[PDB]
Amino acid sequence: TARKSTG
Amino acid sequence: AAGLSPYADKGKCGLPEIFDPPEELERKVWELARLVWQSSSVVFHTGAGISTASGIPDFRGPHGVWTMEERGLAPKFDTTFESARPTQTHMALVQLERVGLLRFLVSQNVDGLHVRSGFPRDKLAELHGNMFVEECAKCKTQYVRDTVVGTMGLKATGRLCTVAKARGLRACRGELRDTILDWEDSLPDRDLALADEASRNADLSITLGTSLQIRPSGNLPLATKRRGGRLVIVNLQPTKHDRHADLRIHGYVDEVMTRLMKHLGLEIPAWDGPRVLERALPPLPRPPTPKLEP
Ligand SMILES: Nc1ncnc2c1ncn2[C@@H]1O[C@H](COP(=O)(O)OP(=O)(O)OC[C@H]2O[C@H](O)[C@H](O)[C@@H]2O)[C@@H](O)[C@H]1O
Ligand SMILES: CCCCCCCCCCCCCC=S
Ligand SMILES: [Zn+2]
């Protein structure tokens, strides 16, 4: 479950 | 931007634009045409910069939505989402896909323009959502709409699922939600998996109008490089992955795709109006071999 982010 | 998290990291906004001088530009777009032609599997990655010509602002350009918010200002919408027209970049991607010169399209755009341009849904991953698409929270059926669904952030839209169930034909009645990710939402499982496979097996990843600051999307083009392929970054601002580009092109994306289509003997089709396509049409045959830079 990879998430929308910068880092 | 209504109901969405005010806790997001907006990244680096407002970096100045760079413009490759014309001679350099023409030579880099010839080199692009060559790698498109030499490459078997070609994957495109598109961000907000391919829709600025249609009147929709980007997030982090000089006049982007995030850029303006950092500095106290609201952004400027020239066009509404419903009345926005596919660009020559969108239409060039339709044609590239028709003749076998595009394997898969990964987009971070929620503007609905890929879908509305006619680009086949089965070769498209909309990793961040689509303002026109809502999804049933119970059976996962998607509904593509002609006007924007009215919520953002995976909220209930107010409409219910109309699917007749396999046994007994009764309407599902599940909650319809928008497909627009908020900050730190989980990406769509299937679309991500497919974008990742495509990106891992590509010979050539080409990015257009993204600063590549958001993951995991922004990193899919590196996967390509990881397994031996090349990487081309087309963007006016610098991008986070500039140091990994085989070829960088700082110019307007419409302008690059026009020359790129000229060099490969492809006509960019005109856009008849919103026309959703679920499955890629049968391939038109590979084009007649293109001519060379003198
Ligand atoms: N006509 C053009 N030609 C070439 N480049 C352009 C053009 N117009 C703008 N640019 C460049 O195009 C780039 C657009 O970069 P960004 O604004 O970060 O958009 P993203 O898609 O990568 O943002 C990712 C996500 O972040 C958000 O939170 C959303 O969730 C997004 O989905 C800039 O560097 C411009 O210089
Ligand atoms: C469509 C390009 C210009 C943006 C205008 C609509 C606002 C974008 C909604 C997406 C919110 C991003 C949250 C993820 S970090
Ligand atoms: Zn349902």
Side-chain angles (χ1 to χ4, degrees), chain B residues 29-39 96 99 101 259-266 285-294:
Chain B
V29 183
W30 282 103
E31 177 47 11
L32 181 57
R34 261 169 253 131
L35 302 145
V36 172
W37 197 260
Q38 297 157 39
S39 301
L96 292 158
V99 311
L101 292 173
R259 293 146 202 197
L260 168 67
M261 295 311 255
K262 191 77 182 303
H263 308 337
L264 317 144
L266 306 183
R286 208 170 212 287
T289 292
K291 226 158 67 71
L292 286 51
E293 198 181 8

Coordinates of all heavy atoms in Angstrom, one line a residue, chain B residues 29-39 96 99 101 259-266 285-294:
Chain B
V29 N 15.4 17.1 -29.9 CA 14.2 16.5 -30.5 C 14.5 15.5 -31.7 O 13.8 14.4 -31.7 CB 13.1 17.5 -30.9 CG1 11.9 16.7 -31.3 CG2 12.8 18.4 -29.7
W30 N 15.4 15.7 -32.6 CA 15.9 14.7 -33.5 C 16.4 13.4 -32.7 O 16.1 12.3 -33.0 CB 17.0 15.2 -34.5 CG 16.4 15.9 -35.6 CD1 16.4 17.2 -35.9 CD2 15.8 15.3 -36.7 NE1 15.7 17.5 -37.0 CE2 15.3 16.3 -37.6 CE3 15.5 14.0 -37.1 CZ2 14.6 16.1 -38.8 CZ3 14.8 13.7 -38.3 CH2 14.4 14.8 -39.1
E31 N 17.3 13.6 -31.7 CA 17.7 12.5 -30.9 C 16.6 11.7 -30.2 O 16.7 10.5 -30.1 CB 18.8 13.0 -29.8 CG 19.3 11.9 -28.8 CD 19.8 10.6 -29.4 OE1 19.9 10.4 -30.7 OE2 20.1 9.6 -28.7
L32 N 15.5 12.4 -29.8 CA 14.3 11.8 -29.2 C 13.6 10.9 -30.1 O 13.3 9.7 -29.8 CB 13.3 12.9 -28.7 CG 12.1 12.3 -28.0 CD1 12.5 11.5 -26.9 CD2 11.3 13.5 -27.6
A33 N 13.2 11.4 -31.3 CA 12.7 10.7 -32.5 C 13.5 9.4 -32.8 O 13.0 8.3 -33.1 CB 12.7 11.6 -33.8
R34 N 14.9 9.5 -32.7 CA 15.7 8.3 -32.9 C 15.4 7.2 -31.8 O 15.2 6.1 -32.1 CB 17.2 8.6 -32.9 CG 17.8 8.7 -34.3 CD 19.3 9.3 -34.3 NE 19.3 10.7 -34.8 CZ 19.8 11.8 -34.2 NH1 20.5 11.7 -33.0 NH2 19.7 13.0 -34.8
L35 N 15.5 7.6 -30.6 CA 15.3 6.7 -29.5 C 13.8 6.2 -29.5 O 13.6 5.0 -29.2 CB 15.6 7.3 -28.1 CG 17.1 7.8 -27.8 CD1 17.1 9.0 -26.9 CD2 17.9 6.7 -27.2
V36 N 12.8 7.0 -29.8 CA 11.5 6.5 -30.0 C 11.5 5.3 -31.0 O 11.1 4.2 -30.7 CB 10.4 7.4 -30.4 CG1 9.1 6.7 -30.7 CG2 10.2 8.5 -29.3
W37 N 12.0 5.6 -32.2 CA 12.1 4.7 -33.3 C 12.9 3.4 -33.0 O 12.5 2.3 -33.3 CB 12.6 5.3 -34.5 CG 12.3 4.5 -35.7 CD1 13.2 3.7 -36.4 CD2 11.0 4.4 -36.4 NE1 12.5 3.1 -37.4 CE2 11.2 3.5 -37.4 CE3 9.8 4.9 -36.2 CZ2 10.2 3.1 -38.3 CZ3 8.7 4.6 -37.0 CH2 8.9 3.7 -38.1
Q38 N 14.1 3.6 -32.4 CA 14.9 2.4 -32.0 C 14.4 1.6 -30.9 O 14.8 0.4 -30.7 CB 16.4 2.8 -31.7 CG 17.2 3.5 -32.8 CD 18.3 4.4 -32.4 OE1 19.0 4.1 -31.4 NE2 18.5 5.6 -33.1
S39 N 13.5 2.1 -30.1 CA 13.1 1.4 -28.8 C 11.9 0.6 -29.1 O 11.0 1.0 -29.8 CB 12.8 2.5 -27.8 OG 13.9 3.3 -27.5
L96 N 0.6 8.2 -31.1 CA 1.8 7.3 -30.8 C 1.3 6.0 -30.4 O 1.9 5.0 -30.8 CB 2.8 7.8 -29.8 CG 3.5 9.1 -30.2 CD1 4.1 10.0 -29.1 CD2 4.6 8.6 -31.3
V99 N 0.0 3.6 -33.5 CA 0.9 3.0 -34.4 C 2.0 2.1 -33.7 O 3.0 1.7 -34.4 CB 1.6 4.0 -35.3 CG1 0.5 4.9 -36.0 CG2 2.6 4.8 -34.6
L101 N 4.1 2.8 -31.3 CA 5.2 3.6 -30.7 C 5.1 4.0 -29.2 O 5.9 4.8 -28.8 CB 5.5 4.8 -31.6 CG 6.0 4.5 -33.0 CD1 6.1 5.7 -33.9 CD2 7.4 3.7 -32.9
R259 N 7.4 18.7 -33.3 CA 8.6 18.3 -34.0 C 8.9 16.9 -34.0 O 9.5 16.3 -34.9 CB 9.8 19.1 -33.5 CG 9.7 20.6 -33.8 CD 10.2 21.5 -32.8 NE 9.6 22.9 -32.9 CZ 10.1 24.0 -32.4 NH1 11.2 24.0 -31.6 NH2 9.5 25.1 -32.6
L260 N 8.5 16.2 -32.9 CA 8.8 14.8 -32.8 C 7.9 14.0 -33.7 O 8.4 13.0 -34.3 CB 8.5 14.3 -31.3 CG 8.5 12.8 -31.1 CD1 9.9 12.3 -31.3 CD2 7.9 12.4 -29.8
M261 N 6.6 14.4 -33.8 CA 5.7 13.8 -34.8 C 6.1 14.1 -36.3 O 6.0 13.2 -37.2 CB 4.3 14.3 -34.5 CG 3.7 13.7 -33.1 SD 3.9 12.0 -32.8 CE 2.2 11.4 -33.1
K262 N 6.6 15.3 -36.6 CA 7.2 15.6 -37.9 C 8.3 14.7 -38.1 O 8.3 13.9 -39.1 CB 7.6 17.1 -37.9 CG 8.0 17.6 -39.3 CD 6.7 17.9 -40.1 CE 7.1 18.4 -41.5 NZ 7.9 19.6 -41.5
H263 N 9.3 14.5 -37.2 CA 10.4 13.7 -37.6 C 10.0 12.2 -37.8 O 10.8 11.5 -38.5 CB 11.6 13.7 -36.6 CG 12.1 15.1 -36.3 ND1 11.9 16.1 -37.1 CD2 12.7 15.6 -35.2 CE1 12.4 17.2 -36.6 NE2 12.9 16.9 -35.4
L264 N 8.9 11.7 -37.3 CA 8.5 10.3 -37.5 C 7.4 10.2 -38.5 O 6.8 9.1 -38.6 CB 8.0 9.7 -36.1 CG 8.7 9.8 -34.7 CD1 7.6 9.8 -33.7 CD2 9.5 8.5 -34.5
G265 N 7.0 11.3 -39.2 CA 6.0 11.1 -40.3 C 4.6 10.8 -39.9 O 3.8 10.2 -40.6
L266 N 4.3 11.2 -38.6 CA 3.0 11.1 -38.0 C 2.2 12.4 -38.0 O 2.7 13.5 -37.7 CB 3.1 10.6 -36.6 CG 3.9 9.3 -36.5 CD1 3.9 8.8 -35.1 CD2 3.3 8.2 -37.4
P285 N -0.5 -0.2 -38.5 CA 0.8 -0.8 -38.7 C 1.9 0.2 -38.3 O 1.8 1.4 -38.5 CB 0.9 -1.2 -40.1 CG 0.0 -0.2 -40.8 CD -1.1 0.0 -39.9
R286 N 3.1 -0.3 -37.8 CA 4.3 0.5 -37.6 C 4.5 1.5 -38.8 O 4.2 1.1 -40.0 CB 5.5 -0.3 -37.4 CG 6.6 0.3 -36.5 CD 7.7 -0.6 -36.2 NE 8.3 -0.3 -34.8 CZ 9.1 0.7 -34.6 NH1 9.5 1.6 -35.5 NH2 9.5 1.0 -33.3
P287 N 4.9 2.8 -38.5 CA 5.0 3.7 -39.7 C 6.1 3.4 -40.7 O 6.9 2.5 -40.5 CB 5.2 5.1 -39.0 CG 4.8 4.9 -37.6 CD 5.1 3.4 -37.2
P288 N 6.1 4.1 -41.9 CA 7.2 4.0 -42.8 C 8.4 4.7 -42.3 O 8.3 5.8 -41.8 CB 6.7 4.7 -44.1 CG 5.7 5.7 -43.6 CD 5.2 5.2 -42.3
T289 N 9.5 4.0 -42.3 CA 10.8 4.4 -41.8 C 11.1 5.9 -41.9 O 10.9 6.5 -43.0 CB 12.0 3.6 -42.4 OG1 11.9 2.2 -41.9 CG2 13.3 4.1 -42.0
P290 N 11.4 6.6 -40.8 CA 11.6 8.1 -40.9 C 13.0 8.5 -41.4 O 13.9 7.7 -41.3 CB 11.4 8.5 -39.4 CG 11.8 7.3 -38.6 CD 11.5 6.1 -39.4
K291 N 13.0 9.7 -41.9 CA 14.2 10.3 -42.5 C 15.1 10.9 -41.4 O 14.7 11.0 -40.3 CB 13.8 11.3 -43.6 CG 14.6 11.2 -44.9 CD 13.9 11.7 -46.1 CE 13.7 13.3 -46.1 NZ 15.0 14.0 -46.3
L292 N 16.3 11.4 -41.8 CA 17.4 11.6 -40.9 C 17.8 13.1 -40.8 O 17.4 13.9 -41.6 CB 18.7 10.8 -41.4 CG 18.7 9.3 -41.3 CD1 17.5 8.6 -41.8 CD2 20.0 8.8 -41.9
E293 N 18.5 13.5 -39.7 CA 19.0 14.9 -39.5 C 20.2 15.2 -40.4 O 21.2 14.5 -40.2 CB 19.3 15.2 -38.1 CG 19.3 16.7 -37.8 CD 19.7 17.1 -36.3 OE1 20.0 16.2 -35.5 OE2 19.6 18.3 -35.9
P294 N 20.1 16.1 -41.4 CA 21.2 16.5 -42.2 C 22.1 17.5 -41.6 O 23.1 18.1 -42.2 CB 20.5 17.2 -43.4 CG 19.2 17.7 -42.9 CD 18.9 17.0 -41.6

